[PDB]
């Protein structure tokens, strides 16, 4: 993985030694080249994963997440350079350094072959994320949002660390390849019940599981755009990726330990979708939308079927690009009206016709219009969950109805109707803003032409 | 209700006639009943007991509610009509012309020259308009939403821009 | 009822301005200032037929002939209906007629 780790670190000297006015040009140009080279990770085989060395490996589950992670860095620089335009030069470079360090930890997280290595890098993402939110957030509540994010994560991670070190003691290794051949069944006992909870509750918090989701709307409402893009697109996926890897060694106990968490996700997705219908804050609506979408991923991972893992893989990528796009779209409005209230600025299709096309495209992917990968992922989870129990089709079907209702309601509220009379500073969309949305939606739609590369290792 | 008794009767009369017109459809039929209805109003036109007149009105309202057409005719552009707000998506505010690119403004050199004069007139008149309102508004603030006319020559009526420059009803 | 003298006067004043504003929405003769029978119709439909039918059908036929039908079970035909007395082109076989009808009639 050193062909990606070293170039990513080189983004730090490049940013720091760039001429004052060129920090955004240079970092964006070279972070796109790194994203270009990330396509070499797609040398995947039917049987064996791509195992580079004793430290790092790539398979069909980490490759799409790795390509998504490196694609996102150049997009966050475009989204960031406006509201930082008046920032002190050095503090601009530190902000960019935090994003670069986040990509560095993330690409190593997704490729670490050792679970304790995964944990350290998994837990290291907290530092840059916390700093971004609390330092470059714009409101008072960014400090509380930082603490909730910090202590929700550590509350689950510290039990996870104990469980992993216990597992290496009794199994001898935490290398993921080794654990595939040396895994032994987990038998019923109160001791193994708590080993199961420790191994999973750290990932459930990052998804987030309904019930443990209340840190997420806080963080989003207070984070800067770049913090919201990485948090929604990639950081939520750390939990899903961790659950797809750790469930290997939790069988067959996952058969009955999954039940409470499937109930929370099946019911939680209906309630979070319904909450989206009454949200008054635009960023908070998109945050509660992620909780609804990620509840499908939890259900899919927990029922453990070939179709459910393919569906969950597609959902994570598709939701990553869609949720990031929606946040950027709401930010473009916020940079104008300087408010997150959804009802404040209405009838924007009249004043910003092309930005209204981006809003339409983003909403359609959110409600999963065929054949988008948002639907493909969502459909595969529904097909497999129906086999798990036919009655779930009712909850799955209802969620699609509610998901359509609030996706188009957000489109209708802000883009249609009459424009707000007194808001007279809606300047035409900048080339920067239009390019930012096209870089979300075009790759998302292109993947429909070849979806196998986002269907994970069970394809 | 803010409306006087005299205003209430008239609104009922107009409302009653319109719903009567929905029932009749045919104009000759509508004419016959419209005259009978006008007779009922003319019968008590000179009632001078405001307890009886108020009773007569309240009973009339109850009769209208029982006899109203469930689907009364609505003018296409009235609230609830089939063309209501149909054109709001074509009404663009005039401040949008400030953001036009120079090359866009170059296609209408004469319209954008006239536009500047109006903007100048708005800038020059504003301070006087604010002053006129301050020295006419009673202590404590206004009591009604009625605005004053201009008094001096060369003064424009206070708060006129968004009334004068509002979009046309058929903007495109 | 009617307008009070102040209500009337204000409407008169906004009326003068509004009508002058509407008059100013008219375009001058030079505006906008832009920058720098069967034989015709037959040509117009000749080009449309060529570009929108002939070129697409050339591409489709090349696609179907040399890429789709060269793979198994890509294009599947319902087999032709054979009737009594028919002749098979492939094998030159004749299908026997049907047996003599009872011959009810009306």
């Amino acid at each position: 993985m050193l062909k990606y780790i070293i170039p990513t670190i080189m983004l730090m000297p490049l940013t720091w030694l760039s001429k004052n006015n060129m920090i955004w040009v240079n970092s964006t140009a070279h972070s796109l080249l790194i994203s270009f080279t990330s396509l070499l990770l797609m040398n995947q085989f039917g049987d064996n994963s791509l195992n580079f060395s004793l430290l790092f490996f790539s398979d069909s589950l980490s490759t799409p997440l790795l390509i998504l992670t490196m694609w996102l860095l150049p997009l966050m620089l475009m989204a960031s350079q406006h509201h930082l335009s008046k920032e002190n030069l050095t503090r601009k470079k530190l902000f960019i350094t935090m994003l670069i360090s986040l990509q560095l930890f993330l690409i190593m997280t997704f490729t670490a072959m050792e679970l304790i290595l995964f944990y350290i890098l998994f837990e290291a993402t907290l530092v840059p994320t916390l700093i971004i939110i609390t330092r470059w957030g714009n409101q008072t509540e960014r400090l509380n949002a930082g603490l909730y994010f910090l202590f929700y994560t550590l509350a689950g991670s510290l039990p996870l660390l104990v469980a992993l070190i216990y597992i290496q003691n009794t199994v001898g290794s935490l290398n993921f390849l080794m654990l595939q051949y040396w895994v032994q069944p987990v038998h019923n006992s109160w001791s193994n019940v708590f080993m199961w909870l420790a191994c999973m509750m750290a990932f459930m918090v990052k998804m987030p599981l309904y019930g443990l989701h209340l840190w997420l709307p806080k963080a989003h409402v207070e984070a800067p755009i770049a913090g919201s893009m990485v948090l929604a697109a990639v950081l939520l996926k750390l939990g899903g990726y961790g659950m797809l890897r750790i469930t290997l060694i939790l069988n067959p106990m996952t058969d009955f330990m999954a039940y409470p968490f499937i109930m929370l996700s099946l019911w939680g997705m209906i309630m979070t979708s319904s909450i989206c219908l009454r949200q008054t804050d635009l960023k908070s609506l998109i945050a509660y939308s992620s909780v609804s979408h990620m509840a499908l991923v939890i259900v899919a991972i927990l029922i453990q079927t070939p179709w459910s893992y393919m569906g969950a893989t597609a959902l994570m990528i598709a939701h990553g690009l869609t949720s990031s796009m929606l946040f950027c779209l709401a930010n473009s409005n916020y940079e104008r009206i300087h408010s997150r209230t959804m009802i404040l600025a209405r009838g924007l299709q009249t004043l910003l016709p092309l930005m209204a096309t981006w809003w339409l495209l983003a909403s359609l992917t959110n409600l999963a219009l065929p054949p988008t990968i948002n639907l493909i992922g969502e459909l595969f989870v529904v097909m497999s969950t129906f086999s798990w129990s036919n009655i779930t089709i009712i909850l799955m079907g209802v969620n699609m109805v509610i998901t359509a209702l609030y996706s188009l309601y957000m489109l209708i509220m802000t883009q249609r109707g009459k424009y707000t009379y007194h808001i007279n500073n809606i300047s035409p969309s900048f080339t920067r803003e239009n390019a930012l949305m096209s870089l979300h939606i075009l790759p998302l739609l292109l993947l429909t032409l070849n979806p196998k590369i986002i269907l994970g290792p069970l394809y | 209700a803010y409306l006087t008794h005299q205003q209430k009767v008239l609104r009922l009369y107009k409302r009653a006639l319109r719903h009567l017109e929905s029932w009749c459809i045919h104009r000759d039929k509508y004419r016959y009943f419209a005259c009978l209805l006008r007779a009922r109003f003319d019968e008590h036109k000179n009632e001078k007991d405001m307890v009886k007149a108020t009773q007569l009105l309240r009973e009339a309202e109850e009769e209208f509610w029982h006899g109203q057409h469930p689907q009364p005719y609505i003018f296409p552009e009235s609230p609830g009509g089939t063309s209501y707000e149909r054109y709001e998506c074509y009404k663009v505010p005039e401040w949008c012309l400030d953001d036009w690119h120079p090359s866009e403004k170059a296609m209408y050199p004469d319209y954008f020259a006239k536009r500047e004069q109006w903007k100048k007139l708005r800038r020059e008149s504003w301070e006087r308009e604010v002053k006129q309102l301050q020295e006419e508004t009673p202590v404590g603030g206004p009591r009604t939403e009625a605005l004053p006319p201009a008094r001096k020559q060369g003064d424009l009526p206070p708060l006129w821009w968004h009334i004068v420059t509002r979009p046309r009803e058929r903007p495109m | 009822s009617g307008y009070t003298p102040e209500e009337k006067l204000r409407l008169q004043q906004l009326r003068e301005l509004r009508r002058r504003w509407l008059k100013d929405q008219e375009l001058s003769p030079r505006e906008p200032v832009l920058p720098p029978n069967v034989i015709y119709k037959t040509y117009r439909h000749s080009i449309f037929a060529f570009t929108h039918v002939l070129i697409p059908v050339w591409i489709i036929h090349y696609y179907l002939k040399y890429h789709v039908t060269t793979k198994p079970y890509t294009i599947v035909e319902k087999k032709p209906r054979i009737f009594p007395g028919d002749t098979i082109l492939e094998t030159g076989e004749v299908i026997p007629p049907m047996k003599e009808f009872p011959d009810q009639h009306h």
Binding site: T350, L351, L352, P353, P428, S429, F430, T431 | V92, P93, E94, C96, L97, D99, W100, H101, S103, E104, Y108, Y111, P167, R168, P171, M172 | Q25, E26, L27, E31
Partner: peptide
Amino acid sequence: KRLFIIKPSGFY
């Protein structure tokens, strides 16, 4: 009479 049609800028 040709009336000027107010639009948002389409140049961008």
